Curated annotation (Swiss-Prot), chains A, B:
Modes of activity regulation: Inhibited by micromolar concentrations of guanidinium chloride. Inhibits the ATPase activity, but does not dissociate the hexameric protein.
Record-listed ATP 2 binding positions: 593-600
Protein name: Heat shock protein 104
InterPro entries the record matches: AAA+_ATPase, ATPase_AAA_core, Clp_ATPase_C, Clp_N_dom_sf, Clp_R_dom, ClpA/B, ClpA/B_CS1, ClpA/B_CS2
Clp R domain: residues covered: 1-144
One function term, GO molecular function aspect: ATP hydrolysis activity
Lineage: Eukaryota, Fungi, Dikarya, Ascomycota, Saccharomycotina
Pfam family, one: AAA
Amino acid sequence: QFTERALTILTLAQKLASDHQHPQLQPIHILAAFIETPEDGSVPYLQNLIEKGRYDYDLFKKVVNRNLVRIPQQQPAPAEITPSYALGKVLQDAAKIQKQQKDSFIAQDHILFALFNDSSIQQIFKEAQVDIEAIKQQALELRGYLSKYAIDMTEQARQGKLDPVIGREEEIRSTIRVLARRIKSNPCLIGEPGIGKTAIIEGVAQRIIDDDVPTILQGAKLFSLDLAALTAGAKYKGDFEERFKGVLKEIEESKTLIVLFIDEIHMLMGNGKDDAANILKPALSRGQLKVIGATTNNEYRSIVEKDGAFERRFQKIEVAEPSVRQTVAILRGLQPKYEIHHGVRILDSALVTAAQLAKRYLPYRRLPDSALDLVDISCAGVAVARDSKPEELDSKERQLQLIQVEIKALERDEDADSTTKDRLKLARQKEASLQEELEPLRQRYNEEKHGHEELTQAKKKLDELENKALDAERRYDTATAADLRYFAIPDIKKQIEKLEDQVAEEERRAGANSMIQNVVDSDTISETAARLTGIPVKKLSESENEKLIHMERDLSSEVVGQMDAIKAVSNAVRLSRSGLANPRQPASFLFLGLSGSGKTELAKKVAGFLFNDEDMMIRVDCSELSEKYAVSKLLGTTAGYVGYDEGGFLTNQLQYKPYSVLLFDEVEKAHPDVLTVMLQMLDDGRITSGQGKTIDCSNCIVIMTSNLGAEFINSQQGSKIQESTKNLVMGAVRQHFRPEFLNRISSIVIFNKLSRKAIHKIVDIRLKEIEERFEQNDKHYKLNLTQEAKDFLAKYGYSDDMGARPLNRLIQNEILNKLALRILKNEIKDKETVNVVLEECLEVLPNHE
Amino acid sequence: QFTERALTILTLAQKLASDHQHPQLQPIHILAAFIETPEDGSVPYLQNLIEKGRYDYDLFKKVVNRNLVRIPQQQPAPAEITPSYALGKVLQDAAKIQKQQKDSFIAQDHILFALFNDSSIQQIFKEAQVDIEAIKQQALELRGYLSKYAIDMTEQARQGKLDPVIGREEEIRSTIRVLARRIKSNPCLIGEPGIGKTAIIEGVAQRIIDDDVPTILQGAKLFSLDLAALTAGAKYKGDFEERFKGVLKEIEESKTLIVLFIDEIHMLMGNGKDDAANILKPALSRGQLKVIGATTNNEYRSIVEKDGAFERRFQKIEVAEPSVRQTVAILRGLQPKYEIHHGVRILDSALVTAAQLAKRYLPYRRLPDSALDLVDISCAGVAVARDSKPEELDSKERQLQLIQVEIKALERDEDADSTTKDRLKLARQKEASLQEELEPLRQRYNEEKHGHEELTQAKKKLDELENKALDAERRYDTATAADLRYFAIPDIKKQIEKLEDQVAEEERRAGANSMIQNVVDSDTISETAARLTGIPVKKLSESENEKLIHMERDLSSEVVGQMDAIKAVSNAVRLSRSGLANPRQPASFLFLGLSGSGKTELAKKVAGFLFNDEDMMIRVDCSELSEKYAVSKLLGTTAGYVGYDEGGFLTNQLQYKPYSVLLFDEVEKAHPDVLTVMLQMLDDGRITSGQGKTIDCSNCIVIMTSNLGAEFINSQQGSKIQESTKNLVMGAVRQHFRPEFLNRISSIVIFNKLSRKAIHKIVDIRLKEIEERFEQNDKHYKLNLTQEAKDFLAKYGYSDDMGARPLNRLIQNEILNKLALRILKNEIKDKETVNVVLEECLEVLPNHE
Ligand SMILES: Nc1ncnc2c1ncn2[C@@H]1O[C@H](COP(=O)(O)OP(=O)(O)OP(O)(O)=S)[C@@H](O)[C@H]1O
Ligand SMILES: Nc1ncnc2c1ncn2[C@@H]1O[C@H](COP(=O)(O)OP(=O)(O)OP(O)(O)=S)[C@@H](O)[C@H]1O
Ligand SMILES: Nc1ncnc2c1ncn2[C@@H]1O[C@H](COP(=O)(O)OP(=O)(O)OP(O)(O)=S)[C@@H](O)[C@H]1O
Ligand SMILES: Nc1ncnc2c1ncn2[C@@H]1O[C@H](COP(=O)(O)OP(=O)(O)OP(O)(O)=S)[C@@H](O)[C@H]1O
């Protein structure tokens, strides 16, 4: 079919044959059809591909008019009996040209290409155009180089390959509102990268296409001017200015109220620069050039700090992150796209779960991207598995080849006639069994694959019908809108439903099919999340009974005594993983006590327990504090400063390990310099670093620790600290920290004197671990602590003022020192005996062998 | 060889000879190369040497273009052939001109001088150009960097299309006066960005074209510079400095005198001097280089302190934000511009509102900037509102189209004849019904559109006639000015008035145009501000007293009891809001009652209402307080002493939240020296600090709290405290506090003891908040509190001394921690059962499922 421009030329050619009473419509008339006027700025006459291509128009009009005179007349009714072979071919070739250029309709431009292929003027010395070489270049020389350096967003949005962007309607309308401004008329989208800023623009393109804009903008058009525009479409010094003040100049006039945009967005800080004004200001001032800009939060600040003129030319727009609900709605709209992408079924609950998980395990990553990546990655994953089902197929194929080896090893011989090798027949029988089992597995699997291919295509076809329906609706093309809405779409819809039923669900499983090829809400998605990030905080691992429910016992086992603290912890972690801890606040505690009490041991054991890794913990030296409080703290240094470790000791670790237990050392030594930062983590954990990037602390439990309370706790008035003493501690804590800081801590916890009844068990744990960690048991002890070593250790070391620490020392002082001596003296070959003789008395083994 | 302009103009001559297929390239083609188009603005054609040299350029245009046509046409092989002697000589002579001018390349003007010497127009009335010495005088007017780095503000002003500058008349004159100086004549505008500092520059541009400028300056041009030659980008050392030198010296040649303007001195400074940026400016502080600089008050001081020279190169010209009334005057001057800029009408009260509101909500942004945007945005909003036309028409037309689709869909069938689908005729009735509604709606909208349209067009015509009159008047063209005043302008005014008759405000529609809602006072403006900043109570078109009163009623309802306290506060606040209280004094209160009484919450609610945010509350622990009162308060330590974070806790919040509430928690425990500071704090809001800067507390309510008389309140003498009880808490206040304090406090506010009869409401409110705040779910309780929880929570929880603090803790432990555990046990699918067992617990709703 033809465009309005092309159809006009066709129509005019026919008109001219009738007007001149000619029996045949010839290229001469179509050439005449182009030269409607003698206008210098008209593409049909002097901005024409022919003029710029090869033959001059003063000469052209002479050629055309000479032929119009030479072509014979009729008595009007017989005009145009034929179009000649020539226009038949040219007009159809113009369709061929569409196909070469991948255009939807025949352009007048295409008719000119068709004419170049067939342009020949009868004469002894015939006139002609170059077959096509010049015109391909001349097409670029029409306003169209815009398409060389830019994507016509409205053309593409109208054509297809554009997602149903939703949840951005507020922002789309706001962007349009800015375009409706008179001074700051160039909206700018600001936020996280990857947030749908382009999607907003695309949404605007759709509204322009639909004419759902405030009248003035109905005459508008959107283009993405980039990449090629920036650099790739050129190679010489000065080419920038030439393509810039070329494509922009073309854009600036006549061809609709063109609005441009950048996809590399921050790029204006390099694509503007010397031309920061020239890129727009005078193009807007002289007419209608408008743009939709964009930048990240950090880049926004940079373009402002660098220039700032952009705040006179542009209007800053914040772009939101969607809620899980909104994210899911987005995923649902695109769910069939994803199913088509991989030929995989996707559960609705997988979109919900992926969105919930993405926020829970990667809170600092864009939610809709992360949710999607989790899905597209897992979709891709199962699609890969389904290529071979190797567990059955590779296993049998290997067994078959192993048989082939046995076959040649036994067959290609003289001993082949002896039972020595003729035993081979047994392997051949096995070969046959494997071939017979394998082929139906193979074909069954191919059938399962085909079912997915059928679904893929059925869904694809439906969407194409929809794309077409949407264009028909905006054209108010009732006829094709009806062709699609009635019967065609319902047909494919029903085919899809039938194809889904072809899965042949049976009571034994969701399909007669042996393979899954689906995205299961938790199994597929939770697994993928774990494979991608290690720790799946919302996995809800089966063993909850120990993992949080009986955490008190696990903590009691690792941390003996301090039952009050353990119970305080147990309540805390249950709130953090049950989801009850309100999302507005990471759980946080202050651990107060005496040295050797185990207060940091408990926190480490919490990390141990929750992540199965005590090294999951991130430590903060809150006592090493001065005005430098940057790279070593939760803020980092700031972009523009020398060095790239912008929180290189913490902020990067917090994102690296998205959640953990963050623990601060002796916070009593801390100052507001960082306490007012820790505060930003204590609740509403969104600390923005000097990178412009945010920690977004959520799941992470934050522990503050201190011996501040020792001032009263060390009264030792019972191992269990009593009210009074605790209030004095509380008082002192409030003296040290802003009480409001403290009020954002979930609870302040006071540790007890580590009781001797606890220590009496702790030392066994320690001694066991001490020995086990000493490389290999090529030495070590038999470790018969008996009643006596345990009691010596107690009587000579369970100090009320050092807890477990003096025991570490005692053990070394006695137990390991004597061992070392027995080792050095070659009294031990392996292991060693343990006892006390009155006075620790490590015994000695028979001399080393 | 040739330079870019020269090689191009030669290339064009050569191109024309080959394009028109001429046998020879000659003076006609080079003249044609210069006369590219009829545009006089083409540098090659009329503002060129061609018009300025005398020759009747119309003759060159006609003769040359006619000759391109008359010169014989040839085949491509004979096309062009040679430049001949004729142009050989011209180009060779152009080289001789290079020698004359010291030009490294041949210039287009050299070509013209040479061309002019040899070529003439052979006509019966033959002409030739004035000799080249006269022509060179004209050549020297063109160029000899600003075109790539600056905007010619005076020429812009001369052409109109420049906003009138309002409220800066003296600042404009001040810079002119300074520019008149023989040395160090560069003024620098000092003030915050967005204050209209460039408005002054625009104003100067207007003074130049108005001829109000001293002759010595009058003959000068005015440019807006910086950034393009400072911050835009560099690859090497000196890239900006090269551009500086370029401009710094180009300015000394040909172009009389040029006044430049620098957007920001802070970007210049000198990078540790380092022979960079700013250091190049003092170099020409006597060397003409007239320039108006600009920076901020804050940076200015540090620029000068670090530089030492700047203050002797540039003059310190201060610029400040306009008052709200001045802002409105600016807006009024722009009001009709906004109307034509947007195609809307604007109420004057909207300008008033915009200026008032814009100031009130922007502690971090300039009034004239934001007032101008508030108006440009809000009126853009109204312009966007024209969407009403397609909104109403499309909602209906869309349904119409859906109906039409059904119609074509069902007509093309066999069931179409069956009533099965022939009931379709009803769809046709609906199509028609909608068409009948759509046509008068559409025509209504067309009329509405045209009404405003024509009004706008007439206003635009008026403004351009006015621009012509203003130019005619200032340039003393009394003929033009008189004609414009001689009814041209009065008549367009009459047309505008007749168009107002066509607006035809109807009694039912106060402007016959629903598309143009108009910028309606504060409805449009508050809406706009709210859309841009958040939605406060402040959005309402209410007096300060009414906003307060409506909120006081909510306050009385939300707080349990304490109505007497609320009224005491309300009275004082109203006195203050009215301006009757002396403005120097912030309101302040002493909240006297029981600990746990809600006194803090009253104050928070006051913040929640008067400042629309409970979380803006600033708090002081007065019990943890001794003789050293510093950082934790307002004073900070004295700078010169460690404790640079002056008034780290309170001053910082007050200075960043000037409109808030500050509490003194248990103020009766404050150290006596602090209490004397308090006297300072209770009036004369210019409260001191360590840096010497005062607080200027006005809009911050300061509430001191006290439990001094708590024991009398405990007497339970009425649910609202009665005489002989409240008199004793005041007695205690008189005993403790000096009369001096009591004589400054707006009111001593007395709180009552209140039983569970209404405290239970608090308990319920908190329970509602607690379940509702769970952002990710709604597993709502079967909240079977029954009487047992009402009292348990009010018996083992809510305390006469600690209020709700223990409720919160009971709920966390007996409800949320119990809930967390059973969630992790997977015993909850949805909802949960309350089961108070006498203490408290939850029953598991599923059967431990
Ligand atoms: N509201 C939405 N509805 C549908 N798809 C969306 C939506 N928001 C984002 N997406 C998709 O999420 C991705 C992020 O979109 P983009 O607009 O490219 O991000 P961006 O903000 O443009 O960042 P850059 O700098 O252009 S990568 C895209 O692949 C979009 O298709
Ligand atoms: N209740 C306990 N159960 C098991 N081990 C314990 C216990 N208490 C202390 N320890 C041991 O004591 C050490 C940690 O003691 P803590 O008191 O947490 O550390 P600390 O004394 O605070 O050291 P700081 O605070 O960084 S100086 C570990 O090596 C533990 O094995
Ligand atoms: N008195 C006035 N008369 C006319 N226009 C004004 C007036 N005051 C302010 N403006 C306009 O309001 C804005 C404030 O101007 P400036 O203070 O120069 O902004 P700025 O400091 O230049 O900010 P940048 O750097 O250009 S984003 C300008 O865009 C002026 O056009
Ligand atoms: N009459 C009341 N109106 C509203 N809330 C009240 C009332 N009485 C008690 N409360 C609640 O109980 C608490 C009392 O708070 P406050 O009086 O600030 O306690 P406080 O005296 O500040 O000392 P703490 O340590 O914060 S309890 C608040 O959280 C209130 O919600």
